[PDB]
Design an enzyme around this catalytic site. Structure first.
Site, PDB file in Angstrom:
ATOM      1  N   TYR A  15     -29.806 118.112  -5.685  1.00  0.00           N
ATOM      2  CA  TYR A  15     -28.880 118.887  -4.868  1.00  0.00           C
ATOM      3  C   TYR A  15     -29.507 119.275  -3.529  1.00  0.00           C
ATOM      4  CZ  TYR A  15     -26.385 119.196  -9.301  1.00  0.00           C
ATOM      5  OH  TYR A  15     -25.742 118.894 -10.478  1.00  0.00           O
ATOM      6  N   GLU A  77     -35.986 130.928 -12.874  1.00  0.00           N
ATOM      7  CA  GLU A  77     -37.279 131.378 -13.381  1.00  0.00           C
ATOM      8  C   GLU A  77     -38.194 130.176 -13.127  1.00  0.00           C
ATOM      9  OE1 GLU A  77     -38.447 131.105 -17.790  1.00  0.00           O
ATOM     10  OE2 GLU A  77     -36.284 130.864 -17.922  1.00  0.00           O
ATOM     11  N   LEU A  79     -41.425 127.598 -13.943  1.00  0.00           N
ATOM     12  CA  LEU A  79     -42.301 127.027 -14.977  1.00  0.00           C
ATOM     13  C   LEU A  79     -43.191 126.072 -14.212  1.00  0.00           C
ATOM     14  CD1 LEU A  79     -39.636 127.760 -16.732  1.00  0.00           C
ATOM     15  CD2 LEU A  79     -40.920 126.579 -18.501  1.00  0.00           C
ATOM     16  N   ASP A 123     -26.777 115.497 -16.811  1.00  0.00           N
ATOM     17  CA  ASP A 123     -27.806 114.726 -16.116  1.00  0.00           C
ATOM     18  C   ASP A 123     -29.220 115.021 -16.585  1.00  0.00           C
ATOM     19  OD1 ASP A 123     -28.796 112.894 -14.171  1.00  0.00           O
ATOM     20  OD2 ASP A 123     -29.208 114.585 -12.823  1.00  0.00           O
ATOM     21  N   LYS A 125     -32.927 114.568 -17.883  1.00  0.00           N
ATOM     22  CA  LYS A 125     -33.988 113.613 -17.593  1.00  0.00           C
ATOM     23  C   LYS A 125     -35.286 114.363 -17.749  1.00  0.00           C
ATOM     24  CE  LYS A 125     -32.623 114.199 -12.791  1.00  0.00           C
ATOM     25  NZ  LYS A 125     -32.078 113.321 -11.694  1.00  0.00           N
ATOM     26  N   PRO A 126     -36.396 113.646 -17.958  1.00  0.00           N
ATOM     27  CA  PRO A 126     -37.685 114.312 -18.131  1.00  0.00           C
ATOM     28  C   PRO A 126     -38.023 115.301 -17.030  1.00  0.00           C
ATOM     29  CG  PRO A 126     -37.858 112.034 -18.828  1.00  0.00           C
ATOM     30  CD  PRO A 126     -36.515 112.182 -18.126  1.00  0.00           C
ATOM     31  N   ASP A 141     -31.087 123.118 -14.947  1.00  0.00           N
ATOM     32  CA  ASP A 141     -29.869 122.623 -14.313  1.00  0.00           C
ATOM     33  C   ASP A 141     -28.637 122.456 -15.204  1.00  0.00           C
ATOM     34  OD1 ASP A 141     -31.667 120.540 -11.862  1.00  0.00           O
ATOM     35  OD2 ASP A 141     -31.423 122.694 -12.063  1.00  0.00           O
TER      36      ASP A 141
HETATM   37  N1  LIG Z   1     -37.746 126.223 -12.228  1.00  0.00           N
HETATM   38  C1  LIG Z   1     -38.854 125.501 -11.866  1.00  0.00           C
HETATM   39  O1  LIG Z   1     -39.948 125.993 -12.009  1.00  0.00           O
HETATM   40  C2  LIG Z   1     -38.712 124.232 -11.343  1.00  0.00           C
HETATM   41  C3  LIG Z   1     -37.507 123.913 -10.637  1.00  0.00           C
HETATM   42  C4  LIG Z   1     -37.289 122.622 -10.067  1.00  0.00           C
HETATM   43  N2  LIG Z   1     -36.177 122.386  -9.433  1.00  0.00           N
HETATM   44  O2  LIG Z   1     -35.895 121.193  -8.972  1.00  0.00           O
HETATM   45  O3  LIG Z   1     -35.300 123.352  -9.228  1.00  0.00           O
HETATM   46  C5  LIG Z   1     -38.319 121.616 -10.212  1.00  0.00           C
HETATM   47  N3  LIG Z   1     -38.161 120.442  -9.707  1.00  0.00           N
HETATM   48  C6  LIG Z   1     -38.666 119.215 -10.377  1.00  0.00           C
HETATM   49  C7  LIG Z   1     -39.522 118.427  -9.392  1.00  0.00           C
HETATM   50  C8  LIG Z   1     -40.880 118.142 -10.013  1.00  0.00           C
HETATM   51  O4  LIG Z   1     -41.868 118.168  -9.011  1.00  0.00           O
HETATM   52  C9  LIG Z   1     -39.525 121.933 -10.919  1.00  0.00           C
HETATM   53  C10 LIG Z   1     -39.740 123.230 -11.490  1.00  0.00           C
HETATM   54  N4  LIG Z   1     -40.842 123.514 -12.133  1.00  0.00           N
HETATM   55  C11 LIG Z   1     -41.853 122.520 -12.581  1.00  0.00           C
HETATM   56  C12 LIG Z   1     -42.884 122.265 -11.500  1.00  0.00           C
HETATM   57  C13 LIG Z   1     -43.451 123.325 -10.735  1.00  0.00           C
HETATM   58  C14 LIG Z   1     -44.405 123.051  -9.728  1.00  0.00           C
HETATM   59  C15 LIG Z   1     -44.767 121.710  -9.518  1.00  0.00           C
HETATM   60  N5  LIG Z   1     -44.238 120.661 -10.243  1.00  0.00           N
HETATM   61  C16 LIG Z   1     -43.307 120.959 -11.216  1.00  0.00           C
END
Ligand SMILES: NC(=O)c1cc([N+](=O)[O-])c(NCCCO)cc1NCc1cccnc1
EC number: 2.7.11.22
Length: 294
Positions: A15, A77, A79, A123, A125-126, A141
């Site tokens: 998005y 939140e 992670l 949607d 996915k890993p 999501d």
């Molecule tokens: N809610 C969250 O914490 C979070 C949100 C999104 N997102 O898209 O809203 C996201 N994107 C997935 C892209 C992967 O790089 C990854 C997240 N955390 C895992 C993370 C944190 C720091 C570095 N690599 C992975």
């Protein structure tokens, strides 16, 4: 930011851009997603806002929906890692079965909760599955696809991954059901086990044919109504089904049995998240600590 201080750019979601940010007042660290284009539908606002009430331990909490300056931001939140990165990091040795089982079990609890509340992901996915040091995994999501309507792409001409899309979606069905999420999760379960994507299609038709080559070209016997689907063509090649013993070796029969039920062609025959939780595969489920390097 009016209240945040961008820590880093986490990536480029489907998005929009996502940042790790700290609330300057509360001091909490969160994930901030800037939503993509020129108006921000009010229908979407109400729908998204509804998701703030959808709280469960295996669902990434939506903390706030901010519609200011006619821009939309979603605060989630935070992670530290996603399952795609974890799988790559575990490629040499593989994720241990007890942990694969714990994660699958937790993800099914999350789906059961969302589905009982009439919320679909659509949607999975890993990269949308987030994990922490405690052995927890959460779905991120949920509900955004319906609320924001058609996905299309990210915002930087990134290629949409079709690897986890259910066959009914690929065949043009316009109405999604909870079964689409079970299909995606089955594909992910198989990938954790074999350390290779199950159906890595690089086009919509390649995706569909990879599914057909493995599970057999569907027909009216196994999938009543399939030949009347919008994009079904009588000209599709007819491939014979392969044995699961060859698709996800060396997974045991409990695992293969559950996977086969999550990948049934007919969405109506596909196992529900609730029913899957009761499958004998989970008889000895536990909650191991993952080796996470942050
Ligand atoms: N809610 C969250 O914490 C979070 C949100 C999104 N997102 O898209 O809203 C996201 N994107 C997935 C892209 C992967 O790089 C990854 C997240 N955390 C895992 C993370 C944190 C720091 C570095 N690599 C992975």
């Amino acid at each position: 930011m009016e209240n945040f201080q961008k820590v880093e750019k986490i990536g480029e979601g489907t998005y929009g851009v996502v940042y790790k940010a700290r609330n300057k007042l509360t001091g909490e660290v969160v994930a901030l997603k800037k939503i993509r284009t020129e108006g921000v539908p009010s229908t979407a606002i109400r729908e998204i806002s509804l998701l703030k009430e959808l709280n469960h331990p295996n669902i990434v909490k939506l903390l706030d929906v901010i519609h200011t300056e006619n821009k939309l931001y979603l605060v989630f939140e935070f992670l530290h890692q996603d399952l795609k990165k974890f799988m790559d990091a575990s490629a040499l040795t593989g994720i241990p079965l007890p942990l694969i089982k714990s994660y699958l079990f937790q993800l099914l609890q999350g789906l059961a909760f969302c589905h009982s509340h009439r919320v679909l992901h659509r949607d999975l996915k890993p990269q949308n599955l987030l994990i922490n040091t405690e052995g927890a995994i959460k779905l991120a999501d949920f509900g955004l696809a319906r609320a924001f309507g058609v996905p299309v792409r990210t915002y930087t001409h990134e290629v949409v991954t079709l690897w986890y899309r259910a066959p009914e979606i690929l065949l043009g069905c316009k109405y999604y059901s909870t079964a689409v999420d079970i299909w995606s999760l089955g594909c992910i379960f198989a990938e954790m086990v074999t350390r290779r994507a199950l159906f890595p299609g690089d086009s919509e038709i390649d995706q569909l044919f990879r599914i057909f080559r493995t599970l057999g070209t569907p027909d009216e016997v196994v999938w009543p109504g399939v030949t009347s689907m919008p994009d079904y063509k009588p000209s599709f090649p007819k491939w014979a089904r392969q044995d699961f013993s060859k698709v996800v070796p060396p997974l045991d029969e409990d695992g293969r049995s559950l996977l086969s039920q999550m990948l049934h062609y007919d969405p109506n025959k596909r196992i529900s998240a609730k029913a899957a939780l009761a499958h004998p595969f989970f008889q000895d489920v536990t909650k191991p600590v993952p080796h996470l390097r942050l």
